[PDB]
Design a protein around this ligand. Structure first.
Ligand SMILES: C=C(C[C@H]1O[B-](O)(O)c2cccc(F)c21)C(=O)O
Ligand SMILES: [Zn+2]
Ligand SMILES: [Zn+2]
Length: 231
């Protein structure tokens, strides 16, 4: 049932409904020779939608907003980018131009500016230290510590017990480290432990790229990360 990378042409966006008012969005993009799927989240808050991460690029994010109008019919009023790389902020400008208020932590906004990437407008307060969590409309934002990047956020949707890991959580099919130039490999297993200790009742865990699972994706990610570190 969950759409897979070979099912989504670059430029099209799938929505997958996880629970009442909780969707993931799935798109695909070419990077360094290969085509990757990429996940974010849509969470209904009454008559508005919160968006978690772009669809990775201006074209995909415009297709995202178009799919939301067709399939859901509620406006996206706020977006959160979970770290500073292009599959999370790429398309912020399309969101801004459509009227979406775009958010990220101060660190993410600074890392995005330094790297040349699109920059969310608004700063998220309360997320500076590992273990910090804040409610943001219908979701909980959690800063687990440095992992895939130093700034990466994870997101929990209480109504549905959905944990979105972003690029800090790998899918089961991913058995090698996914480009770790900006990662903190010594801290990543500890940051994952913080996630486990905070959301032990998670039912549905979504990696940044690929198929959702359970909390077994956290242990898998630690294994992949430690395996890369020892050799
Ligand atoms: C192998 C994946 C690539 C994917 O993730 B990224 O580092 O946010 C990032 C940035 C730019 C391109 C891109 F394909 C990606 C990974 O886990 O890092
Ligand atoms: Zn990244
Ligand atoms: Zn990524």
């Amino acid at each position: 049932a969950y759409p897979t990378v070979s099912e989504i042409p670059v430029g099209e966006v799938r929505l997958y409904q996880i629970a009442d008012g909780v969707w993931s969005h799935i798109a695909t993009q070419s990077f360094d020779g290969a085509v990757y799927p990429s996940n974010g989240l849509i969470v209904r808050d009454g008559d508005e939608l919160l968006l978690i991460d772009t669809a990775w690029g201006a074209k995909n994010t415009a297709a995202l907003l178009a799919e939301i109008e067709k399939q859901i019919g509620l406006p996206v009023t706020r977006a959160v980018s979970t770290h500073f790389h292009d599959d999370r902020v790429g398309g912020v400008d399309v969101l801004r131009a459509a009227g979406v208020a775009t958010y990220a932590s101060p660190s993410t906004r600074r890392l995005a500016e330094v790297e040349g990437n699109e920059i969310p407008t608004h700063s998220l307060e309360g997320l500076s230290s590992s273990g910090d969590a804040v409610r943001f409309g219908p979701v909980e934002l959690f800063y687990p510590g440095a992992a895939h990047s130093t700034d990466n956020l994870v997101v929990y949707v209480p109504s549905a017990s959905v944990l979105y890991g972003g690029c800090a959580i790998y899918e089961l099919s991913r058995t090698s480290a996914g480009n770790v130039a900006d990662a903190d490999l010594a801290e990543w297993p500890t940051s994952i432990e913080r996630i486990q200790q905070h959301y032990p009742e998670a039912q549905f865990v979504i990696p940044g790229h690929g198929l959702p699972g359970g909390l077994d994706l956290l242990k898998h990610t630690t294994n992949v990360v430690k395996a890369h570190t020892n050799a």
